[PDB]
Symmetry: C2
Subunit: 305 residues, 2 copies
C-alpha cells in the first residue's frame, strides 16, 4: 500500500529524444520513424519571438540548416514542413528505437508524464495535469522546449504534449503533436494570460477514494448531498462543476470502498468549508487534483507496462 504521484517508466521516450539546432537556437525533438518533431520557434532569434512571421522566417531555411543530433550521431534531414506550431523534419533513417505510438489531444483534467530534456538528453520525469485553463505547472528551464508529455497503455505510448512556452506568470504552455496549442496560447513573446485556475473536482474525489483505500478516513462525515447542492459550493471555491459523467467514472471506486459518490462529495464539501484543521490526507495538507480516477485504479491495482 501507500500512494505516490508516479510517472510512467520513461525508457521508451528516452530512445526518441534528439537535439535540434537551427542557427543559435538549440532545443529538443521527438524522433519517431523517419520524422523529427520539434517546436517551430527553433527558427527564431530572441528578437524574432517578439513578433515572428513563421512563414517568412521559414523561407530562408533549408534542410541543411537543421542540425539533428541523436546522441553522438548526425541525422541527414531530407525534407521539412510546418504543421501548425510544429516542424516535421524528414530524416533518412527511421529511429530503430521507435515504440508503438499514437498522437492524442487530451482533455482538460487528464494527466500525463513529462520527460524534461535539455540538448536532447533527459533530465528527469514527473506527472502533470493539463489544467482546466490549459496550462501546466511544470519544471522547464531554458533549452527544455520540445520535451514531451505522454501516457503508456501496455506497449503503446500516447504522446499528448510538446513544451513550447513559459508565460510571464511562470506557467507553461504547449501543443499536441499535430502542433495545435492547448488553450488560446500563441508562440510569440507577448502578454498572454491563463484564466482563472480551477480545481479538477473529479480528480480530488478520486484522490479521496485513494486515501480511504489507504487508511486515511478521518475526513469521512455523516452527511450526503445532491449534485446541484454540491456544485453551488464548488462554484464558490472555483472547483469545476461535477457532472453525471464524472459520477459514472467514479463508480468502480465507489463500489470498492462502499462509499456512494454523493457521500464523498459531502465529505469534500466540509473540507472546502472548514479546511483540514492542520491535518493531512495522504501526506498532503491540501486537496490534490493531479490524479485521475483511472490513475487511482491503475496504482491501487498495480498495472504494469
Amino acid at each position: 500500500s501507500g500512494f505516490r504521484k508516479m510517472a510512467f517508466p520513461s525508457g521508451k521516450v528516452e530512445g526518441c529524444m534528439v537535439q535540434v539546432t537551427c542557427g543559435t537556437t538549440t532545443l529538443n525533438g521527438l524522433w519517431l520513424d523517419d520524422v523529427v518533431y520539434c517546436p517551430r520557434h527553433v527558427i527564431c532569434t530572441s528578437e524574432d519571438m517578439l513578433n515572428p512571421n513563421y512563414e517568412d522566417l521559414l523561407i530562408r531555411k533549408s534542410n541543411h540548416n537543421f542540425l539533428v543530433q541523436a546522441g553522438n550521431v548526425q541525422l541527414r534531414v531530407i525534407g521539412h514542413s510546418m504543421q501548425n506550431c510544429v516542424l516535421k523534419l524528414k530524416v533518412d533513417t527511421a529511429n530503430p528505437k521507435t515504440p508503438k505510438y499514437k498522437f492524442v489531444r487530451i482533455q482538460p483534467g487528464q494527466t500525463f508524464s513529462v520527460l524534461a530534456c535539455y540538448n536532447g538528453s533527459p533530465s528527469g520525469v514527473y506527472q502533470c495535469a493539463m489544467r482546466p485553463n490549459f496550462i501546466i505547472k511544470g519544471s522547464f528551464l531554458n533549452g527544455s522546449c520540445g520535451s514531451v508529455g505522454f501516457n503508456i497503455d501496455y506497449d503503446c505510448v500516447s504522446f499528448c504534449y510538446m513544451h513550447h512556452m513559459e508565460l510571464p506568470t511562470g506557467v507553461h504552455a504547449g501543443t499536441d503533436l499535430e502542433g495545435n496549442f492547448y488553450g488560446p496560447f500563441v508562440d510569440r513573446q507577448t502578454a498572454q494570460a491563463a484564466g482563472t485556475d480551477t480545481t479538477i473536482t473529479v480528480n480530488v474525489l478520486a484522490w479521496l477514494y485513494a486515501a480511504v483505500i489507504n487508511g486515511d478516513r478521518w475526513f469521512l462525515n455523516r452527511f450526503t448531498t445532491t449534485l446541484n447542492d454540491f456544485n453551488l459550493v464548488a462554484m464558490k471555491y472555483n472547483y469545476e462543476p461535477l457532472t453525471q459523467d464524472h459520477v459514472d467514472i467514479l463508480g468502480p471506486l465507489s463500489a470498492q470502498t462502499g462509499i456512494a459518490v454523493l457521500d464523498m462529495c459531502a465529505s469534500l464539501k466540509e473540507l472546502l468549508q472548514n479546511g483540514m484543521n492542520g491535518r493531512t490526507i495522504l501526506g498532503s495538507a491540501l486537496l490534490e487534483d493531479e490524479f485521475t480516477p483511472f490513475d487511482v485504479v491503475r496504482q491501487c491495482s498495480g498495472v504494469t507496462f
Copy 2:
C-alpha cells in the same frame, strides 16, 4: 522555471528488471552482468514469513528451483548464494543492457528514484527520501518486492535500495544491494516499528532556497538566528538538528540567492512557530523535506544524463 519532485529517467533500470519465481512466490530481481539480485524471502511461504530460518529453507533449494524470466525469455541459473538478506543468482548470460553501475549505501536524508515493478515489469517511477528513522513512504503493492531505488550521475547508475517489507504502520523497509537493511528491520513478519519520524532540516532549507529562486518569498522575514537557538526550536518540532556541515552544503544556494543560511533558518523558525496561515510554498501547504541541496542545484540548473 517552476520546481517539481522529479525522478531520474528510468530506461537504464528498466532494462535490468526481471521476474524471479521460487515455489508459489514471484517477485522482482535486478539483472546486472551475469547475476540476478532479489530478496531472499522469495524462498518463503506466507507461513514461513512468521519465523523463517533462511539457512534451513535455502538447503532445500537448488539452481533449477529459481525461475528467472527476462521479458519472455528464461534465464539458466548456474549458481546461487545468500548475501545478508539478498540472493545472488548466477545466470549463464550477461545482461546485454547492463549499464555502468555502482552499489551504494546511502545516508538518512538522501533521496533516490524508485522504479516500482510487478512480475518484473515496470509500473511507474517516483522520487523518495530515506527518512531519518530508515523507512521510506512509497507505493508498494503485493508483488512489488525487489523493486530498486537508485540515483544517476551521467551514465552511471548508483543502486541504493531494494524493497523487501511493508511494516504494520504502512511504511516501507528494504536493504542496500549487499542486502543489509537500512535501520534495525528484519525480513520476518513480526511487530517492528520505526522510531519517531523527524524532518530533514537541511532539505527543508534547500527547498526554501528553491522557492526563493522561483519567486516564492512571502516567507522571508527580518530576523536571523544562531545554530544553537534554531536547534532548540528544531528539537521541539522533531526536526533533525542542523550542523556546520549542513550549513556548508547549503553555501552555493546561499550565494546564488544572497540569503545567509542563518537568515533562512530564522524564516524556517517563524514558519514552524506560526504555520503557513493557509498559504503555500511551491504549491505545498507544508514544509517539503524530500529535496536535497544537490537535488535543488541539479533541477535549478537543468543537469542531464
